[PDB]
Design a protein around this nucleic acid. Structure first.
Lengths: 91, 62, 100
RNA sequence: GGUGAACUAUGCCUGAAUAGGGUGAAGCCAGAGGAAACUCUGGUGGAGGCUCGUAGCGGUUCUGACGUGCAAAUCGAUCG
RNA sequence: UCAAAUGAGAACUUUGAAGACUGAAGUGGGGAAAGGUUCCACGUCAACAGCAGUUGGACGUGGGUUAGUCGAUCCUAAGAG
RNA sequence: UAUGGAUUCUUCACGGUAACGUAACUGAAUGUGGAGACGUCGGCGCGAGCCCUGGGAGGAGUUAUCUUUUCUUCUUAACAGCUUAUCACCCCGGAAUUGGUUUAUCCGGAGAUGGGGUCUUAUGGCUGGAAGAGGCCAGCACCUUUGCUGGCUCCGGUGCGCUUGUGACGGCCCGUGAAAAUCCACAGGAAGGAAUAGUUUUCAUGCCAGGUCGUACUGAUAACCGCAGCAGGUCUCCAAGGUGAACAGCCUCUAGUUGAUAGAAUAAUGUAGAUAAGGGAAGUCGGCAAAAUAGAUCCGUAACUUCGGGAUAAGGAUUGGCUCUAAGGGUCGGGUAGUGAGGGUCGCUUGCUACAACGAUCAACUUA
């Protein structure tokens, strides 16, 4: 059945800290502990080796990314911006 | 996997369920349709046991 | 299959001095052989082939000559004839007596 | 004008050590209800600068013994 | 704890005869530093072994560690110059 | 250095579809990879040893009574040859009814299932080595040197058992976990080679040669140091059985000890223990001190909470011996057709028949 109520995966910590602290950082765990897609085979193996290291075995890719997600939206807009401004300078 | 079962002999009684319901339910469906047929036709002589109100009027005057 | 097992023991060694009755020892066993639970439960599986000089038991029951040694030890304890006889092995299931 | 980081304080490089318990974190499944959202229920599963607690490691206390001691810092109980 | 022997000597030297302990995360087996002939065989007891000591790691003497194949020196680490 | 083979005018092998494979089947500079060469923790599986036990045999004790009794022997090095794995790889295949499948959730049309095969040999097994060894007894022979003379060294089982090495997962890190030393193999076709020889001889066999040191012992309440033959300190490794969850306790066996100036009486005195009617902190600055509890099994639980705690909250019930009962697993099947893939035998539905609900057997300690 359902194991924990609201503590979830940080139930390993239990009643240990200021609860604001556990309340913020449990989300950060959820971020850095997701698996993402290889866009070249279609599957998903991408996951944090380190903060900005986004490892992948399905078709064997690894991208230096953000910290806890792979790509930040800053990389998305400098992406769309070096690319789009590349379509404003190259185009 | 989930839990859904007690132990070996209990699951053997469950094998008697899978056996018992494959056999005793599948053959039940087959004999069900096999018994529907031509009691269909008894209902045909029934619906022609009170609408031959229409069969006692019309065609064979010649 | 049902082969009677042969156990070959010379008992002549004090009897030749006349100081021993092997009919008293085979009599001592013929009520006492622990076959099928009861000692002396000896319905026609056995042979008691004594001589006065050499006793040999050819018996299709569960037996070992080491248990025959265990039959000697209570005997020579009982009549207390220990320390004039060793139940010596010639070879396997082959034994003999002494007189000293 | 000479000597000590062997004691002691600190760094680096190569090496070694740590019963038996409580704890059930996450994962995943089985069921039920709900239109879904979800809601329970039954599990799996084995988290914790977690805990008892042994080896361990220190020493809080009785103000214990000693108090020319086994002892220039011992021994008893006790504790962490 | 008892008998024997041995010696002028037997509390303390042997042998038998007993009872106990550690009890195996051993009073077990050892090994590293450390010590260094203590090791081992004999003659002996000045003196020590706080009574004793006939005994010792005591005194006088001897004997004892074997390598193509096992560690050193190779390498490099911390480091040195 | 010889020998034999090799591999060749296809100058310096064969085959398999690929799996991959061998006794073979040249090579400068430049690279190349690999090894060395390195985090922790968790489960899980497997190797090895140990422990436990049966039968068979040889050795020994018990015995008023029982006691097939309590113990004892039953070994195989480096090294050779065979065998042997997770994993991996190639054909066939196209899958949704999705299937395959972990203990714990993973995979498959970028081919799953599945059906075929190819492969590392960890590992373990077999045999040799290596039985003669060793051992075990058993018998004589006598100063007997003690010599002779036999036999045995067999088959088990068992495990949440112990100790240890593996496999493959899983955890964790704003922590992501040595260096050189060394040796390949492939490019490279440098350069060199057969044609009557040619030869690397990574294919075999066949010659000789193996500095220097260290090595005995203690390793500790006498071989270390503490001033001491000082109750102080001094790094590393191995664990029998009962008992118990336990390396906890306690006993027992091996291993090893059995050493502490002696003697006689028992007065206060302390020291080290215990015991106390009744009352219970008044005593004491002050419950110091002391007393009380406790394991397991079932019940129950307050406040507060930062939700996780609190909580074992608190607080309730149980614990001999015997004779019984229940559940909790594994191997084999389901024949009058003389039957299958054969064509002493031979097996499914098995009542050259072609193939359709169960029963026979071995095994636990687990709760009730």
């Amino acid at each position: 059945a359902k194991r924990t109520k609201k503590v979830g995966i940080t139930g390993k910590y239990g009643v240990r800290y200021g609860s604001s602290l556990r309340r913020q950082v449990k989300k950060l765990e959820i971020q850095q502990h997701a698996r993402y897609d290889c866009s070249f085979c279609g599957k998903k193996t991408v996951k944090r080796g380190a903060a900005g290291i986004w490892t992948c075995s399905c078709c064997k890719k690894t991208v230096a990314g953000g910290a806890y997600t792979v790509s930040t939206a800053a990389a998305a807009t400098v992406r769309s911006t070096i690319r789009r401004l590349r379509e404003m300078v190259e185009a | 996997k989930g839990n859904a079962f007690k132990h070996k002999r209990a699951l053997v009684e469950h094998i008697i369920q899978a056996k018992a319901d494959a056999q005793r339910e599948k053959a039940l469906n087959e004999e069900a349709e096999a018994r529907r047929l031509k009691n269909r036709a008894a209902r045909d002589r029934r619906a022609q046991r009170v609408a031959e109100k229409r069969d006692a009027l019309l065609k064979e005057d010649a | 299959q049902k082969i009677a097992k042969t156990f070959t023991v010379d008992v002549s060694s004090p009897t030749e001095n006349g100081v021993f009755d092997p009919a008293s020892y085979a009599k001592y066993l013929i009520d006492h052989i622990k076959v099928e639970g009861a000692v002396g439960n000896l319905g026609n599986a056995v042979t008691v082939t004594e001589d006065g000089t050499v006793v040999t038991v050819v018996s299709t029951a569960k037996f070992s000559g080491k248990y025959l040694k265990y039959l000697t030890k209570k005997y020579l304890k009982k009549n207390q004839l220990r320390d004039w006889i060793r139940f010596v092995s010639t070879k396997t299931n082959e034994y003999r007596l002494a007189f000293y």
